[PDB]
Amino acid sequence: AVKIRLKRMGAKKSPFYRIVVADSRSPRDGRFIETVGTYNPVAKPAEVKIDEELALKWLQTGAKPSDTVRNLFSSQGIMEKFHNAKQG
Amino acid sequence: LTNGIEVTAYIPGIGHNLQEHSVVLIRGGRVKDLPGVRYHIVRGALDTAGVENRAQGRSKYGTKKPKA
Amino acid sequence: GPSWKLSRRLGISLSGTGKELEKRPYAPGPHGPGQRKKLSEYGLQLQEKQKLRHMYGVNERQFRTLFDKAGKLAGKHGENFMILLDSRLDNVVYKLGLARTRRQARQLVNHGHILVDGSRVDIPSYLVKPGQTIGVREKSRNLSIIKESVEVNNFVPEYLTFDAEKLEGTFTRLPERSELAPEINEALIVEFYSR
Amino acid sequence: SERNQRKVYQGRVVSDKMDKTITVVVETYKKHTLYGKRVKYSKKFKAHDENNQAKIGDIVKIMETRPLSATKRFRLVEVVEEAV
RNA sequence: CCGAAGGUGGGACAGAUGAUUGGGGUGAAGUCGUAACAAGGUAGCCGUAUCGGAAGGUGCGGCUGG
RNA sequence: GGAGAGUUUGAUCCUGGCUCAGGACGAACGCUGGCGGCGUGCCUAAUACAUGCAAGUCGAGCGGACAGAUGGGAGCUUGCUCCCUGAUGUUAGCGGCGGACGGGUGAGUAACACGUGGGUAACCUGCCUGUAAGACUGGGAUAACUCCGGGAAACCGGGGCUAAUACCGGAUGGUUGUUUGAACCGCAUGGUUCAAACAUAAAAGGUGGCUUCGGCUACCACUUACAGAUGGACCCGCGGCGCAUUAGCUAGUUGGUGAGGUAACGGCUCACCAAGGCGACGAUGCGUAGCCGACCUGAGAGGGUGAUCGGCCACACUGGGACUGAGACACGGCCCAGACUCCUACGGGAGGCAGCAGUAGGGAAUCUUCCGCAAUGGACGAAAGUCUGACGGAGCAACGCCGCGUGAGUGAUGAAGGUUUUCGGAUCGUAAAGCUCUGUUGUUAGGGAAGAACAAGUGCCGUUCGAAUAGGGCGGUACCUUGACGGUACCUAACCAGAAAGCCACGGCUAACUACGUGCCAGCAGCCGCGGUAAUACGUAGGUGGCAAGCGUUGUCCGGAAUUAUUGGGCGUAAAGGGCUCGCAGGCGGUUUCUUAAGUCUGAUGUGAAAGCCCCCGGCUCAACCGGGGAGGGUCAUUGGAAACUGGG
């Protein structure tokens, strides 16, 4: 149901992704429940920005991220916090 | 016209191609001098040929940049 | 572009030199050496606006958008527009002394490349912020046109500092409009775009 | 946790003639978008009288509720001032 | 049972079109008068009636915008 | 943050309209045309559509198949041919889940459709979490497969056979209903929790590994309840339209009791009664219209718009219906009726581009019958994977915005030549040529990104399960992988000013003038108005001016216009005081004081999504644009203070 998923923003050749809590039903750029921060792919380095506590708040009500959003959570390290909470 | 209305239009430049049953494209332009006439026949249109021997005011009256 | 013709029509030395108005101070043409009439309010505002935009060589799309962006800044309006066209990069090249006109400085920014803070700029309309060390790359390190304009010594204005050999142009705080141009009357151009 | 409060009005009874109900003129009154002066409008609501303890010309409070029939969404609270 | 469509019927609204017609406007120095503007040669106008090719006239009352 | 000008006259001042100078388009037309970035591109016929795709997937639910050969044998011509059930792959059919999302269109719709704010004690919610109890015991069919039979096909019927995570009994269940006790709490119906009994209501296995063969376990799935989350429903305040030359409109309409129906309240549906209901605060009727965030204009108030993008709605050839499913009364589902297209063997069948491309038509007028699932979503799967015309891109169009161009420095013989000339020259004018020089772009040739993070597969480590170091889940690493765009943006070297400017105007408004031809003709015009033989207004040339790959015309908005005047106008004579009164509704209300708190002001809380305008920084070579951060916008709801004024007592 509820999924934390990337949301396309930006120009044509230069994408940008707001990490956005939406439903699978709703369109990709369309309506959404709340957002956590961002994702710049097209930077030659890194630069992800995740809210890291409200994202954690949505993970626990039951909202399973997509694969790239999941590994961005792993890069900032919220899935380890979620596994520490489940081991709590 | 294509909506069905007959209006008297005007043919601006000097010396015109037109006959009866001629295809004419019409823009809105009031002709103050002749009463009852409030449109222009676009010169350079579908069948209204560009005018003859004209070099100043090229785009109006339809004529191409001739040669030099 | 003749560009002597622009100066003698506008009645101002747009280079700023004894040239282009000596021997022929009237406007152009067959209706020029006779006593022309004075212009109206519209004509005076057009004269001053085109004095400025033919100094800097701007089309009225860029000239209007810089008028608007200068309005979005603070202070006096016509001063800030002068300041924005004296942050323009062709003007920076000709006021560092790397060209004899602004067309030659246009060709320096366009192709005979010149560099700001690193990599390059191919664009004359680049607004130059302060603190920006402007030089040339090691390919066009010292070639004949920049070499001539180095041999010729102009004044460096006090909103600039310029080196000969190292050729880096650095800046100061802001170009005050007392320093910029004495001949162009600002706030007739504000009035020209006020209508 | 006290639950959410329903809308409440006070008004004035127009009619008594329907079976166990009344209609009520709320005279709340408000200003324009353009001229700014504050003009009046009368809103008559259908309201339930389960005891039918009402009269025409009665200042009365009403509570909003679930729709009791067609056009009914209101009931009595406190019959304040009786007609003379 | 409900029920779309269809059928019959009498009305309501709206657009065309119609012999003919009535007023209106605009137009090449057309015809008849000259009603108004001056005390415009009967001061004019307003309302109303009446008559008259036509502007108009006449009555009654009112008005000065004599 | 606010500019005016021409035109009623013989001259003038007011009134007064008209006309112009501006910015905008999903614009079109005309002349012209270089590239790059980003956006946009049937406004008209919700006209009709050839073709191709746009929704499938799971063999870890199931039965049957097709191959295949690890070993096992077979018959001989050395060319070959089987039969046992290895792995291994292929999937008509059952079945589950999806098809209700995503994509299109704006026809309907003037009212809960939408915006904003609430209320639900009157509600539904698959998949997703989290927790708690479970998952026993049997039964009977059916597709496929065959064998007939009927059909032109579409396909259909008959007898056989067979399995499931299909379906059905049955047990056990804290649901649900009933009945009786409590306890506490409201907003009328009422709400929450405890107990008891009665009546029923479940469930399903599959894969891997361990094995004493009983079973045991993980993962997935199944059932019941309770929360969260998400989506959905209904209801109310306010708000956004034109006509009164639309004034009367209703009868399931307006209430009641009772029943049915619904996920739910309800005339939602029906019986029986009552005579109600809406109404100049505009009912009804007619016309028009998707609504909004926003967009254009404006000093603002406003006025206009409702393209793109985003939310809600409604629609799917027209009207009606239900089915299934958690959710549809279903764009690419079904049944019916109508029109249209097609096939027919004349009995009967099939179809719905307002999905992406494209075709024909209507039109002033708007594009490719393209590549890819690499990235972001979706669906299914345990996963690999598959599907995806969403989406990423690519193509066409100056359609818009933005940025760089077509050269640059020097140059007086002011060359030739044009145009003009009182023939002294003036001008095109340093503008050509001279000299010097750049290469953005043009071209050739090399090098070549970010967009990629992953998924899955291994190895570790921590940890939860476990009868256990099996084995699997969860988290962290540690590797190996993956690009349609595309050798694209990009960088680097070589060469030549070589390939690259037009459009409109020049009486005034309004910047910019002369000459020749014409002779109230040809023609121009937005207005004043030009032209009847000395035309700066017509046509041409020179020139100048404006802009500039644009320019001009048109069509509509808004401004100008204080020209609907709230901001911000008027009525003695310019348009305008009802012929005058009596008065209902409405509006307005002298004074002192107490009180109230509806208006008013102020505080806190929530909210007015994202994008957009605005501010501040950042990244694209700058810009457009993108990105981050903030602000703004409510007569909005709840809540708290003030009491001068308006109102209330």
CA distance A7 to A19: 6
Q: Which two three-digit tokens encode residue A82?
A: 């979620």
Contacts (Cβ under 8 Å, ≥6 apart) of C113: C120, C121, C122, C136, C137, C139, C140
CA distance A67 to D5: 45
| Technique that determined the structure | cryo-EM
Query: What is the spatial distance, in angstroms and rounded to an integer, between the CA atom of A62 and the C1' atom of F180?
Result: 43
Positions in chain F where some atom is under 7 Å from a protein CB: 1-3, 21, 29-33, 37-39, 101-103, 118-122, 126-130, 186-189, 228-231, 234-240, 253-257, 265-268, 274-279, 281, 301-303, 309-312, 362-364, 375-379, 390-394, 401-405, 407-411, 414, 419-420, 426-431, 436-441, 450-455, 462-464, 474-477, 491, 493, 502-506, 509-514, 522-530, 539-549, 551-556, 566, 586-588, 598-599, 609, 614-616, 619-623, 625-629, 635, 638-639
Within 10 Å of residue B61's Cβ, how many Cβ atoms? 17
* Sequence letter at residue C132: Q
Contacts (Cβ under 8 Å, ≥6 apart) of C191: C45
Burial of B27 (0-12, 13-18, 19+ CB in 10 A): exposed
Quick one: CA dihedral C145, C148, C154, C157, positive or negative?
A: positive
Q: What angle do CA C47, C48, C50 make, to 5 degrees?
A: 65
Half-sphere exposure of C44 (CA within 13 A, CB side): 10
Q: What are the Cα distances from residue B2, in Å, to A71, B7, D60, D71, D76?
A: 63, 12, 66, 52, 66
Helices (H), B2-64: none
Quick one: CA dihedral C174, C179, C181, C183, positive or negative?
A: positive
Q: Which two three-digit tokens encode residue A75?
A: 């890069």
Question: Given a contact as 3+ CB pairs under 8 Å, which chains touch B?
Answer: none
CB C62 under 7 Å to nucleic chain F? yes
Which resolution in angstroms does this entry have? 3.1
CA distance D44 to C144: 92
CB D74 under 7 Å to nucleic chain F? no
Instruction: Identify which of C80, C82, C29, C79 has the alpha carbon closest to the alpha carbon of residue C53.
Output: C82
Q: Please name every residue paired with B10 in a beta bridge, in sequence order, or none if there are none.
A: B40
Say which nucleotide is closest to residue A86, CA to C1' distance: F474
Instruction: Identify which of B21, B29, B35, B22 has the alpha carbon closest to the alpha carbon of residue B61.
Output: B29
Query: What is the spatial distance, in angstroms and rounded to an integer, between the CA atom of D18 and the C1' atom of E9?
Result: 40
Question: Given a contact as 3+ CB pairs under 8 Å, which chains touch C?
Answer: none
CA distance A12 to A17: 13
Q: What string of DSSP letters covers C61-78? A: HHHHHHHHHHHTSSS-HH
Nucleic strand F contacts from chain A, 6-25, CB < 7 Å: 6-18, 22-25
- Distance between start and end Cα atoms, chain C: 29
Q: What are the Cα distances from residue A26, in Å, to A22, A30, C129?
A: 7, 6, 45
CB C187 under 7 Å to nucleic chain F? no
Q: Match 């004095």 to its residue by tokens.
A: C51
CA distance C104 to C146: 10
Q: Match 């324009």 to its residue by tokens.
A: D32
Instruction: Identify which of C42, C65, C79 has the alpha carbon closest to the alpha carbon of residue C181.
Output: C79
Q: What angle do CA D48, D51, D55 make, to 5 degrees?
A: 75
Contact D47, D34 (CB under 8 A): no
Contact C117, C133 (CB under 8 A): yes
CB C9 under 7 Å to nucleic chain F? yes
Long-range contacts of C143-147 (CB under 8 A, 24+ apart): C143/C112, C145/C98, C145/C99, C145/C104, C145/C108, C145/C112, C146/C98, C146/C108
Helix (H, G, I), strand (E, B) or coil at C89: helix
Contact C137, C171 (CB under 8 A): no
